Write a protein that binds this ligand. Sequence first.
Ligand SMILES: O=C1Cc2ccc(Br)cc2N1
Ligand SMILES: O=C1Cc2ccc(Br)cc2N1
Ligand SMILES: O=C1Cc2ccc(Br)cc2N1
Ligand SMILES: O=C1Cc2ccc(Br)cc2N1
Lengths: 541, 541
Amino acid sequence: TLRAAVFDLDGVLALPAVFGVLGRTEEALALPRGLLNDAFQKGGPEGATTRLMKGEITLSQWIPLMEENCRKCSETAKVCNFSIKEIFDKAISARKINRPMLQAALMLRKKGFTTAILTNTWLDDRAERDGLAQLMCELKMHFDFLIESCQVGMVKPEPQIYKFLLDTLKASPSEVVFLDDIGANLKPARDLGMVTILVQDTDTALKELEKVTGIQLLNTPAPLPTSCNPSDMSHGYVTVKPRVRLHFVELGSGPAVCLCHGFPESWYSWRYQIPALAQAGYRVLAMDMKGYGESSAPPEIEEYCMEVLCKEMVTFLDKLGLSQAVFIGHDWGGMLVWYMALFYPERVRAVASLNTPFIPANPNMSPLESIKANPVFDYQLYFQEPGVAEAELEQNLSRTFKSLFRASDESVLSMHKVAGGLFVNSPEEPSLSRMVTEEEIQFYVQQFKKSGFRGPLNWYRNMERNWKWACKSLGRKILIPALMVTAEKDFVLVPQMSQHMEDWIPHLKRGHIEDCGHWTQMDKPTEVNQILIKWLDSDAR
Amino acid sequence: TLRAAVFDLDGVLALPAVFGVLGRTEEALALPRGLLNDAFQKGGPEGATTRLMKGEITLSQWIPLMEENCRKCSETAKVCNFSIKEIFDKAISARKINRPMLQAALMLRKKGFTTAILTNTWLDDRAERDGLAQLMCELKMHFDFLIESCQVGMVKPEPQIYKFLLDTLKASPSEVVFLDDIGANLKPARDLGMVTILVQDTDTALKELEKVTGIQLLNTPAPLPTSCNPSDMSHGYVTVKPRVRLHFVELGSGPAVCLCHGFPESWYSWRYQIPALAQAGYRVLAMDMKGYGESSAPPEIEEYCMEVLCKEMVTFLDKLGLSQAVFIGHDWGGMLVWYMALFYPERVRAVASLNTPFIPANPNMSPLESIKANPVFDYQLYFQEPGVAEAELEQNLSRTFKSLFRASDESVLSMHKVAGGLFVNSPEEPSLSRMVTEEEIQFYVQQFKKSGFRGPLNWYRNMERNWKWACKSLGRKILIPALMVTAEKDFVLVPQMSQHMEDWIPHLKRGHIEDCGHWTQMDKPTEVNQILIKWLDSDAR
Ligand SMILES: O=C1Cc2ccc(Br)cc2N1
Ligand SMILES: O=C1Cc2ccc(Br)cc2N1
Ligand SMILES: O=C1Cc2ccc(Br)cc2N1
Ligand SMILES: O=C1Cc2ccc(Br)cc2N1
C-alpha cells in the first residue's frame, strides 16, 4: 500500500514549465524547431546543463556556456537583441505554484503520507534570484523533504538519485507514487517498482493520483488557510519594564504588522493569519498580550489599564527598533488598537479592528451607567469582582475553552442574566466545535495553566481609569489609514455598534463577514485573510 | 550639586528649529515680518496651537485652523500656491539630531546624571509622520525620560509642567540644569531655583553647561558607537531541528542582516554594530552561533561540520519566513558566510567577511598537510584532541577572555609553539584591555558557563569533512555582492591571505582597517560601522 508521494517541481508543482519557454521563444522568434532545447541539453551527461544541474557551476556561470551552445546549434542549422539571461529571467518570474497540485500534496500529507519534492535544479546567483527563493520557500514548508539535484550532485534520470530518494523516504519502491512531466525521468522510478504518473494536464494527473491512492483529491471542499505549529515558529521576548516581558511569534519580511488578540485568547488565535500575511509580504508579530501565555501576568488591576498597556506596546516597538507597525486587533486587542491610533499616531502605520467598534467615551455618563444600558454587556459586571470569574473559568480549562470557542449556530452559553455564572446551564463535557480540533483546545489549556484568568480579567477592571484617560481624546479624530471589520453574527460586538464610527474616522474603510460569530479569525479565516491582505496592500504598503 | 540635565527638543537637541522656518518662509515669500509666527501663536493659552501642544487635537486637525489664523493675520495687516502642510512637512524633514548636544547629554548620563527631554510637541498623524517617529526613537533611547506636552496635557511655560518634571526626576530644583532655546520657557525653571541655559549657538551653550557641571563636554575624544544592554534587546528563539535551537538578538526594520560571530565569541561581539546597522535602516539578527550562549550545544563533533551549520542557517531563515538575508561574518562566522554564498546563493542577499579570507580547498592536499605549512595555524592542531583545549579554556573563564580579547599592541598569549597550552607564559590575572570593560568580560564569562568550549571547539574538528564538502564547490564562483574587510594587525588571518580572492569573487569589494587586531568589531567599531553601512547602502539596498 502507498504511503509516500513524490513530486517534481517544474511542470508539476510549478506552472508554466521553464522547459516550455524555449519552444515558445523558438515560435515567437520564428527560429528552427527545437533549436533552443538542443543548445540547452548539448553534450548530454557531460554538457554544461548536467554540470549546472549537479551543482558544479552556478546559473550565472552557465548563461555564457548556453550562449556558446546557441551559437554552435545555429551554425550547424545554417541560420542566425538576443539574450538567454532575459529569456530565463522572464520564464522563472512567470512560473507560479500549481495550486491544485499543492492542494493534492497537502491532502495526502494530512492523511498520513510522507511527501517529497524531487527536482533537477540549479544554484541561482542571478541578481533576481529572490523571486525563486520566495517560491521555493512557500512550497518547501508543505513537504517532509526537498531533494534538489544541485545539492546532492545527482540528477534525474540517474539511478542513484532514485535509490537516494528511497533512502530519505525510508520506503520500498511499491510504497511510492512518483509524479513527473518528463517521461524519461519517470522511467527509472517505474523500473524500481514505483507507481508513476506522467503529468501533462493537472486534472488527469490528479484523477490518476486519486485512483491509485484511494483518496479524494479532485473536487474536494475549499481547504482552510495554512495554520501554525507552535514548535516551528520563531519566538521573541522583550522586557518592557523590570517585572514585565512580552512574548510574540514572528514570521515574514516587510512592513511590521502587530496582531493583538482579545479575551481570553492567545497569539495562537491568529494561527490562520500569520502564514497568509507573511506570504503576502509582511513581517508579522503575533503578540501574547499582557496577562497571557508566555507574556508576564502581574496581579495588580492597574497594570491592565489602557494607558499602561498602550505605553508598554510603544516600549515594545522602541526595544525592537521599530518606528511604526500596523496594528490589527480583535475584541480587547481591537480596543487597544484604536487607542494606539488616538494616543500614538506617529507609531501606528495603519489600524484595523475585527468586531470591536470605536465608540468615544461619554463624558456625561459613568462606564457603569453606560454598561447597564445594554443586556449584552452584563457579563462585564460579573467580571468586576476579583476572584469570582477566575474561580469558574479556571475550574475546568478544557470546558472553559470548549464552551467559549464556538460558531454562531453552536451557542452553548447563556450570556444574558449571568443566574450566577457563565456556565449555569452549560454542559460539563461540551462537544467539540467544528471551528477547533481537540489539539488546538489543549494548546489554549496549556497556555492558561501558567497565569490563569486574573491578568486577562483585569483588562475589564479599569473602566473608570480607562474612561478618564479616553476623555482626553474627545476632541481628536483618527486620520491615519483605518479598517473596521464587522461580523454579522457576533451578538455582543454587533455590526450596528460601528454605525457612527465615520463621525470620528472620516476616511474609515470597511469589511464585513456574513455568518461569522465572535471568534472571527478561526470562524472565517479565509475571508479575514482576503480582507486584511487587500486592505494592507492598498493602505499600509 | 547638579545631578540632572533637562533638554528641550526643537532648537536644542534637534536643528534647525521648526520655529525658524516661519521667519524663513516670511523672508522667502517677502511677507510682513513675524506674520506666520503671529498666526501660529494666535489666541495664546486658548488658541489652536495650545490645544495642539496639550494633545486636545492632532496635527492634521490643527493645519486647517492655522490656515484660518493665516487668513485673519493677513486681513488685519492688509496683504494677500500657499500651503502650511507643505511648509511644515519640509521643516520637520530638515530637522536633524544636534549631534554635539546629544554627545554632551550622553557624557552627563555616563557620569551619573539623570537625563530628560522636556518638549512642547504634537500628536503627528500626517502621512509623513514616520520621519519624526524615527527621529524621536533614535533620540529617546539615550535619555532616562521623555516628557511630551501632548501626552501630559501641560505646556511650557505653565508652572505645573516644571513641578511634574521635578516629580519624575525625583530631584530638587537646585540639582537640575535646564536647557532651552525659548527664553520665556526658561523663566519658570529659573524661578524654582534650577540652573538654566538659553541656547542660541550650541558651542556657547555647551561652554555654559561645561562650567556649571564641572564635566568636560566640549573638545572631548571621539565617543565609541552606541552599544547594547542585553536585558533591553528583543531575544528570538528558533528550533531548527528536535535537539537544536538558535538564539538571536533582533533590532530594527528593513532588509534582514544576519551577523555571524567567530570563536570563542557571542552575539554580543556585534554590540557596537547592532544599534548602528538598525539606525542605518536594516533589520539586524545577531546570532548566537551553534555551540554558543543561549543556542543549543550538542556534544557530537559532526554536529559542527560546515554542511550541517549552513543547512541549519537555511532552516533558521525558513522558520523566520525570510527568503534572504545579507550574511556578515567574522572568523569562523566569516568562513560560514562564504560557504552560505557558495551553496545557498538564492538565500544570500549579499555577503561580507571581517578578517576571514576565502581560500578554496586544495584537492591535492589534506587539510592537516595544508595547516602544517603555516606556523600561525599550529593552534588549530592543539584544538584537535577532544578535551585538551576545553580543560585549559574552561579552567578560568575570566582569565580566558581577558587573555584573548586584547588590542594588537596588548599581546599576552604566545600563539606559536602551543610548550603545551595557550596560557604557557601568560599571567593568571591579566590586566583589563582598553577594548573591554570588566562588565563586558563578565558577560562572556556568564555565557560560557552554560555549555563551555566543547561545541565551539568542534567547529575546528571537522577539517576532513569540511574539505570534502568544499571540493564540491571548486568549479563555482561567488557572483552575488561581496565584501572582504582586512585587519592590518591580525597576525593569524593576515590581510595578505586575501590577495587571490578576486580569482573566485571577480566583483569583490574591499575594506581595510589599519592598527586593527583580530577582534575587529570591538577593536575598531566606528570604522567597521562606516565600512559596513557604506557597503550595505550601495550593494544590499
Ligand atoms: O465605550 C467605551 C468608552 C471607552 C473608553 C476607553 C476604553 Br479602554 C473602552 C471604552 N469603551
Ligand atoms: O474600560 C472601559 C471603559 C469603558 C467605558 C464604557 C464602556 Br460601555 C465600557 C468601558 N470599558
Ligand atoms: O582553506 C580552507 C579550505 C576550507 C574548506 C572548508 C572550510 Br569550512 C574551511 C576551509 N579552509
Ligand atoms: O574545516 C576546515 C577545512 C580546512 C582545510 C584547510 C585548512 Br588550512 C583549514 C580547514 N578547516
